[PDB]
Amino acid sequence: GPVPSRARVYTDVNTHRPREYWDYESHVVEWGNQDDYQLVRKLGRGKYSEVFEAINITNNEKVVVKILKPVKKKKIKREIKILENLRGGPNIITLADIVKDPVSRTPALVFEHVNNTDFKQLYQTLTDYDIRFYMYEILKALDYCHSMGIMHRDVKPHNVMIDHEHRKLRLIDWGLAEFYHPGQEYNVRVASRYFKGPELLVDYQMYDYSLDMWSLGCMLASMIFRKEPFFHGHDNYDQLVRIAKVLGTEDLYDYIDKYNIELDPRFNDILGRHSRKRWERFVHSENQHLVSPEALDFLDKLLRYDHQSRLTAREAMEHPYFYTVVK
Numbered sequence: 495g496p497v498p499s500r501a502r503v504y505t506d507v508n509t510h511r512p513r514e515y516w517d518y519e520s521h522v523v524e525w526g527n528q529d530d531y532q533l534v535r536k537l538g539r540g541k542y543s544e545v546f547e548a549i550n551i552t553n554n555e556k557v558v559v560k561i562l563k564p565v566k567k568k569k570i571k572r573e574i575k576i577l578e579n580l581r582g583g584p585n586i587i588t589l590a591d592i593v594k595d596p597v598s599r600t601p602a603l604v605f606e607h608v609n610n611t612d613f614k615q616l617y618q619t620l621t622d623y624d625i626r627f628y629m630y631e632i633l634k635a636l637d638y639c640h641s642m643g644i645m646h647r648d649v650k651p652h653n654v655m656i657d658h659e660h661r662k663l664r665l666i667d668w669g670l671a672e673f674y675h676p677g678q679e680y681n682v683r684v685a686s687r688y689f690k691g692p693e694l695l696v697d698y699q700m701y702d703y704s705l706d707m708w709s710l711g712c713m714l715a716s717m718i719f720r721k722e723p724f725f726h727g728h729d730n731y732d733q734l735v736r737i738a739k740v741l742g743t744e745d746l747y748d749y750i751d752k753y754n755i756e757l758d759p760r761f762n763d764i765l766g767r768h769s770r771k772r773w774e775r776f777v778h779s780e781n782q783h784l785v786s787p788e789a790l791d792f793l794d795k796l797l798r799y800d801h802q803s804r805l806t807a808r809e810a811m812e813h814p815y816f817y818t819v820v821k
């Protein structure tokens with residue numbers, strides 16, 4: 495059976511915590527007053543909620559209200575407890591209140607307002623310096639949550655809200671996030687296709703914080719190369735093929751062999767044999783102003799098949815890539 499794995503950082507942070515901290519099933523929600531909030535416009539509907547701009551009539555401040563869909567009941571206190579544990583952390587969206595919605599008969603999460611410009615629009619615009627700046631800001635959020643014993647598990651451009659006027663960033667949508675417990679097996683049906691780590695794509699359940707660094711790597715490749723998404727598979731199987739076209743099949747085998755994992759035999763007629771490519775292969779006239787030797791080396795160090803070999807958030811913030819960014 496599979497060889498076990500553990501995180502190389504913050505391995506035991508929840509084992510030394512009081513039970514209250516990670517046992518979200520036992521959490522008692524503190525409900526505020528639903529009358530304080532007035533919905534103004536619908537912003538989006540996801541798998542698991544509907545999201546509104548709203549106004550808080552006790553301070554007239556703009557807020558965001560997320561009304562949960564009545565499904566997968568356990569996710570609900572998990573998300574609340576994670577948001578309460580991380581509140582006040584660098585670049586972590588601030589849960590301001592929780593109220594009972596009388597129409598949906600579910601919890602509605604009330605957050606601080608962020609005035610995001612659209613990722614597709616905003617990616618078209620980032621300068622070299624701005625990619626580095628914003629990458630550092632996200633790393634702050636990820637190191638904070640990882641050091642608090644939590645993995646986000648859905649890092650992607652849609653979940654990283656940016657107010658480009660005020661140069662301010664928030665990591666949102668903690669509904670897939672989980673507590674890291676050494677040796678725990680996790681569901682591999684997390685993150686969105688283009689951002690799933692190789693561990694997910696080969697059905698390896700004993701993963702950790704390092705999943706988020708694979709996703710961050712995919713976001714970085716998409717920005718510096720100006721190709722959205724960078725690994726563009728048709729489904730979860732083709733997703734691994736597209737990765738193996740860049741990383742190579744020999745290092746994929748080395749990975750699965752290390753953890754004594756077998757690929758789904760459905761890979762037998764689709765995977766082929768591929769060499770590992772040099773990252774320069776993806777550079778052209780239209781993206782070259784976004785690329786540098788430091789950018790390519792930092793990317794190379796995030797996008798590893800072996801989750802254990804990837805830079806930690808802390809180590810990524812140390813990287814030469816960020817030397818040009820003002821502290």
Ligand SMILES: O=C1c2ccc(O)c(O)c2C(=O)c2c(O)ccc(O)c21
Nearest residue numbers: 537538545558587605608666667668
């Ligand atoms: O602020 C959030 C926001 C803040 C916290 C969340 O957990 C969240 O899912 C969202 C969110 O989904 C969202 C959106 O879809 C569109 C515009 C937004 O401002 C947001």
